């Protein structure tokens, strides 16, 4: 993550991020809505950061330092560039909605009143088709990635030294290879929980309640499609095992 965004999302909540004199100007219901929207953006910032650790620290480090067999790095990190593109674009839109909403003379005081339309756009049309296709592929290759990682760590000395070296810093404590893969797989099922709670505090404007209700339906449609399109790939699985599923 970049320093500007880290500082903007350093506080535990929207109510602690904004100046207390600005917080005092809003009703309790607006504070509750803004705290959940802040959690959505803050967790999206961290998810994009998990994808950058996978692409830049792990994937690129293995290509530039190790002599792994061709197709091994792709098996460890399936769809990472596509995932990074989807979420970096979505994060850009959330951060621009926050930035446009800032009060003149402030880099921290804002209220986002129209999140619904942004979520409908993210979870419909071509972007939803790409999220569905990418997660159906990623999640079907999840078990194969974990097994390939375990094999390499146990049998390749240079691989073990590389992993131990780049995961040693305390800031990587939660982000080993397997932990990154599970963080990415779990991300998509966090959206309905966050969206439903934002909807709970967005009844003040009927257009907004309607838009978030539509977005929540689209996210659930996407999840059901991804869940139905998953079948774990297995290295060495025979055709007979597959057609007898």
């Amino acid at each position: 993550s970049m320093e500007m965004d880290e500082k903007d999302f350093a506080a535990d909540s929207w109510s602690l991020a904004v100046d207390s004199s600005f917080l005092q100007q809003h009703k309790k219901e607006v504070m509750k809505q803004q705290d959940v929207i802040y959690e959505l953006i803050q967790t999206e910032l961290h998810h994009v950061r998990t994808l950058k650790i996978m692409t830049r620290l792990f994937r690129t480090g293995m290509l530039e330092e190790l002599h792994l067999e061709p197709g091994v790095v792709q098996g460890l990190f399936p769809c990472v560039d596509e995932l990074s593109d989807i979420h970096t674009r979505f994060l850009s839109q959330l951060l621009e909605r926050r930035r446009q909403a800032l009060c003149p003379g402030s880099t921290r005081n804002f209220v986002i009143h129209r999140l619904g339309d942004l979520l409908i756009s993210q979870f419909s049309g071509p972007s939803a088709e790409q999220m569905c296709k990418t997660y159906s592929e990623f999640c079907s290759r999840h078990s194969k990635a974990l097994k390939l990682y375990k094999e390499l760590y146990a049998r390749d000395k240079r691989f073990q030294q590389f992993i131990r070296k780049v995961t040693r810093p305390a800031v990587l404590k939660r982000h080993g290879v397997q932990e990154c893969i599970l963080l990415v797989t779990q991300r998509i099922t966090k959206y309905p929980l966050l969206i439903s709670r934002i909807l709970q505090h967005s009844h003040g404007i009927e257009e907004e309640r309607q838009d978030l209700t539509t977005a929540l339906g689209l996210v659930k449609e996407l999840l059901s499609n991804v869940d139905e399109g998953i079948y774990q790939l297995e290295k060495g699985a025979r055709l007979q095992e597959i057609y007898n599923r």
């Binding site: 078990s143 974990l146 797989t185 779990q186 709670r197």
Partner: protein, 178 residues
């Protein structure tokens, strides 16, 4: 320090997310209670042994039967949660959650945890449950279910007051080390 993995399972309203949040912060949040839990690696020392215990939530995966099992690989201990204010959450334990965890996590110890124990003597809870001819889950009902499903043990806690929270994770660490 050896690394162990813990996953918490249970119905959507069982309080699993709250339990992970309160343990990881060692505090019930005073300003904002997070909606979700990403992951955490707790440094725990139990009976003289140092462990890094990675914590994972299954919240949000309850309706997705192909996504949810992806949380189980290499799990060392399962926390199987129900809410004491919800006898319905206890009824889903023996023939939905238990056979699933035994299938994907064979030989992994399961600790059955009764969450929200502070609601056992909550008058609003008692009145609301009495409308559906119900009452808060009794301690013997929790122990009997844990015995029946072959759980490693039975424990109770309250994320709201923090009572019992530390003991649950220290015991889970002991189970993971066996």
């Amino acid at each position: 320090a050896i690394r162990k993995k813990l996953v918490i399972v249970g119905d959507g309203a069982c309080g699993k997310t709250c339990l992970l949040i309160v343990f990881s912060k060692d505090q019930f949040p005073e300003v904002y209670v997070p909606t979700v839990f990403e992951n955490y690696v707790a440094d725990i020392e139990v009976d003289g042994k140092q462990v890094e215990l990675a914590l994972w939530d299954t919240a949000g995966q309850e309706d997705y039967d192909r996504l949810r099992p992806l949380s189980y690989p290499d799990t060392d201990v399962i926390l199987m949660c129900f809410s004491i204010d919800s006898p319905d959450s206890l009824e889903n334990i023996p023939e939905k959650w238990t056979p699933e965890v035994k299938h994907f996590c064979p030989n992994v110890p399961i600790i059955l945890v009764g969450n929200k124990k502070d609601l056992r003597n909550d008058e609003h809870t008692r009145r609301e449950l009495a409308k559906m001819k119900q009452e808060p889950v009794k301690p013997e009902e929790g122990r009997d279910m844990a015995n029946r499903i072959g759980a490693f043990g039975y424990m109770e806690c309250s994320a709201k007051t923090k009572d019992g929270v530390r003991e649950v994770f220290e015991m889970a660490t002991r189970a993971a080390l066996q």
